[PDB]
């Protein structure tokens, strides 16, 4: 699969991946900066801790940086 990957936020080949994801969570700067954002690819939709948001998708470049 092809996915956007942080920190570069470029489209990269993940030949062994099947999903792209967008992961968001509050670090201790959340009040000043909003949520942290991680973009990656995985073999399967990653499992995450309760206060972490993850959205998985299965099309090339389906996880662009969430600007809107």
């Amino acid at each position, epitope marked *: 699969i092809r996915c956007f990957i942080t920190p570069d*936020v470029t489209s990269q080949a993940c030949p062994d991946g099947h999903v792209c994801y967008t992961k968001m969570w509050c670090d201790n700067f959340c009040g000043m*900066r909003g949520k942290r954002v991680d973009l990656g690819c995985a073999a399967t939709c990653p499992k995450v801790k309760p206060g972490v948001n993850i959205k998985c998708c299965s099309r090339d470049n389906c996880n662009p*940086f969430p600007t809107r």
Partner: antibody
Amino acid sequence: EVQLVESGGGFVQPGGSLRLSCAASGFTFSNFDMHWVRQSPGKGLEWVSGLDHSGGAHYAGSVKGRFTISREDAKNSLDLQMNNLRVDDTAVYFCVRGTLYHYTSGSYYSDAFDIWGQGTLVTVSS
Amino acid sequence: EIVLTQSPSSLSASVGDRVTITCQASQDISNYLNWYQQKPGKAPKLLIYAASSLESGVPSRFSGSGSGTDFTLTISSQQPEDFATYYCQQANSFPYTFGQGTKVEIKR
């Protein structure tokens, strides 16, 4: 596998020069702020110099006029030209990556030093 | 420059002890405060950024707290792996400055 590998360490008389180099692998080097941090038993950890992803250089007052930081993005290398060396420059020098954290509000650099090289010894003595 | 002073400079702990290390800044640095761990002959390792945010893989016994001029690193259950020197570091303003280090030694 993210790596910083230092070279160019050595020893000189006071007033001598050395050039440290750091080879970066496993990340897009040009995207990151890069720094040099030194350590001696008597100075603890001391930030020396930083060269931001925008080409902006910063220096500790202790090295101003004597040290020059540079990078060659095409060669994934960061250098520290050390001139007019003083005995109190004797230290282990670490090549260090500044953090690059993404938030909904944008891109933040050098909050912390997340990747450190093994360090290379510089000795200045008569 | 901003001066960070850690207390104590060294302490002795048993395995499973609660260890607390403080870092005091010469001026307000909001939460621009990191903690590093360093063992002899090794580079420092980043454990905590933004005063309280753990890096990936850092075990839950590590926590950070504070803001402004006063910060605390707590190791709630000291492990053999945790005997090391700890440094705070401010990223509020140039130059970046570190505390003097706190060495955690094994009590026997």
